[PDB]
């Protein structure tokens, strides 16, 4: 994996050593180049992970996720030079440094072979995200959000720490390979249940799971645009990635100790999507939508079913691409009107003709319209859950009904309708905004042709 | 501010006939029943006592509510009509034209130059029109939403740009 | 009752300005002005061809515009589809499956030249 980590690390001096106004260009072009090298790993061998060394390994689970992060890196960079341009050279240089330190930790996390090495970088993503949210966040409540974000995931991660070290002293090794081959049946002793709770709660908090989900509406609403997407597009998936990886030793205790989470998730999706049916703030609307889609993956993972797992990873990446995109949609309109309220800016299709389209198939992809991989993800989970229980469809099917009503609702209120009379500062959309939207839509629909590169190891 | 008794009963008259359109349909039936409505409205002119008039219209509104047509004939270019706000997704406001591009701007030089003429006139008329507004403003804030007209010569009436330069009802 | 003197004067100037404003919304004869566009050999050919405008000039005009539509929208698309269906996708088993050729008692079949027997003696009823 050093063909990716090393250029990413060497890009850190690259930005700092750059000139005054060339930082955006060099960082963008090389990050895009880093993305291209990441695509070299999409080929996964028959039934073996592409084990490179003891330090780093990759399989069909992290292969799509890794290139999603590298592909993301230009997109935050392409979404940041609007509000950041009115700042000193150092602070802009610092901002780029953080995201690159962010992706570097993310790249190391997905490729880590050892659960402890997984663990260290998995919490380490807090440090750059926390400062990004707090420093450049354009709001007042962000100060409370940083505390809410940091403690909430840490409050679950710290009990996780004691779980891994216990496994190391008891079972022996702790890497992703030996655990799978030396997996032993977990008993029903009450101590095993608490270890199950410790080994699981840390991952559910970052998903999030309904109830333990209040840190998204705080963080996402007033996070900076660049930090908003990564936290929405991968950092939620980071909690997801550990769910497949760590549920190799928690069998068969998963069958009995999952009912509270399934009930919390299968009911939370209806409740959280019911949140989305009415939101005064567009960004809050998108953040809660991420809760519902992620709650689908929690159901997907907890069943622990072949079909369920492939649907989980397919939805996991697909949601990240569209959720990041919709956040870019919010940033554009919020930039023109300098506010976040729904009804303030309306009838924007007439004023901006192309953005009417960009927000349109963004909503369709959010709607899991077939064959968009959002559908191939959600539909797989329904089939797996229905096999698990025939009444799952009543709830999870009703989600697609509720998901439709709010998804178009933001399309109806903002894009369609009559133009706002007093608003007159909306200029023609710059080609940067239009291009950035295409950098999200095109890979999504392009990847629809070959879902086998997103269906994960269980494919 | 206050729809007086005469204003309300005329409003009752206008709405009553419009509903009776949907009922009578055919014109010959219309001209008869409208005349009864007219004749039976003329009879209570010497009612004198205003209290009776409220009682005379008390049963009238509910009687209209009794015989109101569930599908009244509402006019297409009106609220509730089929062609209501339909021809609106094309009337982009005037101020959007300022954000045009010079290549686009050079396409229509004469109109753009004349628009600049209207642009300057609004700039010159603003100070006079805002000054005129406050010089005869009523005490304790504006009491009536009606705005003063242009009193002297040359000066344009205050708050005119959006009314005058409103998009046409048939922009296409 | 009845625009008030100030109000009727207000609507008068409002009407006057509105009329003049909509008058500016007219178009001069020169507008719209536009830079020229790279001409095409076929287009200019049909312009000089159609100067006569005779009825027999129009049919070949319409026939040709129907002809090049057929070749570039049916002839080529049916070519690549047939080639795909004849040498790429049918080269895999069970890709194009069709209902069995429905034969009837009495006729004959091709691949062996055998005759399915004639329908035997009917109970011979009539209406």
């Amino acid at each position: 994996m050093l063909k990716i980590i090393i250029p990413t690390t060497m890009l850190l001096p690259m930005t700092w050593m750059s000139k005054h106004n060339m930082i955006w260009i060099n960082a963008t072009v090389h990050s895009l180049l880093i993305s291209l090298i990441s695509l070299s790993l999409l080929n996964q061998l028959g039934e073996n992970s592409l084990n490179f060394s003891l330090t780093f390994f990759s399989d069909s689970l992290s292969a799509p996720l890794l290139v999603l992060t590298t592909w993301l890196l230009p997109l935050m960079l392409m979404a940041s030079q609007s509000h950041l341009s009115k700042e000193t050279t150092t602070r802009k240089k610092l901002y780029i440094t953080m995201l690159i330190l962010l992706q570097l930790f993310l790249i190391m996390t997905f490729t880590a072979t050892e659960l402890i090495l997984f663990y260290i970088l998995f919490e380490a993503t807090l440090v750059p995200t926390l400062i990004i949210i707090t420093r450049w966040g354009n709001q007042t409540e962000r100060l409370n959000a940083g505390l809410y974000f940091l403690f909430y995931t840490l409050a679950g991660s710290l009990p996780l720490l004691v779980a891994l070290v216990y496994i190391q002293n008891t079972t022996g090794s702790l890497n992703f390979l030996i655990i799978h081959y030396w997996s032993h049946p977990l008993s029903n002793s009450w101590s095993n249940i608490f270890m199950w709770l410790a080994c699981i709660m840390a991952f559910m908090v970052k998903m999030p799971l309904y109830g333990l989900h209040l840190w998204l509406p705080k963080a996402h609403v007033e996070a900076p645009i660049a930090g908003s997407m990564v936290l929405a597009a991968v950092l939620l998936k980071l909690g997801g990635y550990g769910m497949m990886r760590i549920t190799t030793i928690l069998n068969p205790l998963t069958n009995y100790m999952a009912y509270p989470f399934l009930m919390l998730s299968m009911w939370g999706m209806i409740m959280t999507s019911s949140i989305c049916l009415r939101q005064t703030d567009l960004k809050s609307l998108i953040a809660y939508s991420s809760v519902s889609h992620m709650a689908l993956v929690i159901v997907a993972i907890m069943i622990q079913t072949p079909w369920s797992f492939m649907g989980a990873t397919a939805l996991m990446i697909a949601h990240g691409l569209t959720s990041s995109m919709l956040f870019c949609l919010a940033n554009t309109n919020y930039e023109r009107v300098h506010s976040r309220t729904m009804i303030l800016a309306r009838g924007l299709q007439t004023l901006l003709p192309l953005m009417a389209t960009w927000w349109l198939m963004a909503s369709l992809t959010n709607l899991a319209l077939p064959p968009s991989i959002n559908l191939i993800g959600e539909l797989f989970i329904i089939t797996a859950s229905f096999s698990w229980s025939n009444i799952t469809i009543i709830l999870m099917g009703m989600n697609m009904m509720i998901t439709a009503l709010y998804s178009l609702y933001m399309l109806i209120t903002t894009q369609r309708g009559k133009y706002t009379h007093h608003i007159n500062n909306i200029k023609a959309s710059f080609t940067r905004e239009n291009a950035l939207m295409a950098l999200h839509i095109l890979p999504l629909l392009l990847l629809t042709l070959n879902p086998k590169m997103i269906l994960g190891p269980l494919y | 501010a206050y729809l007086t008794h005469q204003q309300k009963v005329l409003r009752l008259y206008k709405r009553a006939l419009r509903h009776l359109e949907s009922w009578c349909v055919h014109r010959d039936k219309y001209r008869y029943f409208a005349c009864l409505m007219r004749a039976r409205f003329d009879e209570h002119k010497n009612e004198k006592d205003m209290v009776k008039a409220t009682q005379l219209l008390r049963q009238a509104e509910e009687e209209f509510w009794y015989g109101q047509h569930p599908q009244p004939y509402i006019f297409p270019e009106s609220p509730g009509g089929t062609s209501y706000e339909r021809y609106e997704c094309y009337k982009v406001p005037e101020w959007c034209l300022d954000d045009w591009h010079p290549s686009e701007k050079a396409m229509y030089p004469d109109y753009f130059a004349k628009r600049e003429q209207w642009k300057r006139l609004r700039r010159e008329s603003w100070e006079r029109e805002v000054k005129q507004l406050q010089e005869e403003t009523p005490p304790g804030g504006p009491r009536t939403e009606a705005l003063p007209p242009a009193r002297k010569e040359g000066d344009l009436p205050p708050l005119w740009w959006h009314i005058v330069t409103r998009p046409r009802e048939r922009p296409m | 009752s009845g625009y008030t003197p100030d109000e009727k004067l207000r609507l008068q100037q409002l009407r006057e300005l509105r009329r003049r404003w909509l008058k500016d919304q007219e178009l001069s004869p020169r507008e719209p002005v536009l830079p020229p566009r790279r001409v095409w050999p076929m287009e200019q050919f049909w312009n000089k061809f159609l100067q006569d405008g005779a009825p027999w000039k129009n049919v070949i005009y319409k026939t040709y515009r129907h002809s090049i539509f057929a070749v570039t929208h049916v002839l080529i698309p049916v070519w690549i589809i047939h080639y795909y269906l004849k040498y790429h996708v049918t080269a895999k088993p069970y890709t194009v499956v069709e209902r069995k050729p429905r034969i009837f008692p009495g006729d004959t079949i091709l691949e062996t030249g055998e005759v399915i027997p004639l329908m035997k003696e009917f109970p011979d009823q009539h209406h």
């Binding site: 007439t350 004023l351 901006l352 003709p353 192309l354 023609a428 959309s429 710059f430 080609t431 | 009337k91 982009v92 406001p93 005037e94 959007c96 034209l97 954000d99 045009w100 591009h101 290549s103 686009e104 229509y108 109109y111 998009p167 922009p171 296409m172 | 500016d24 919304q25 007219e26 178009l27």
Partner: peptide, 12 residues
């Protein structure tokens, strides 16, 4: 009679 039509700039 032809008359001006307002349209948001699509050149960008």
């Amino acid at each position: 009679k032809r008359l001006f039509i307002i349209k948001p700039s699509g050149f960008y």
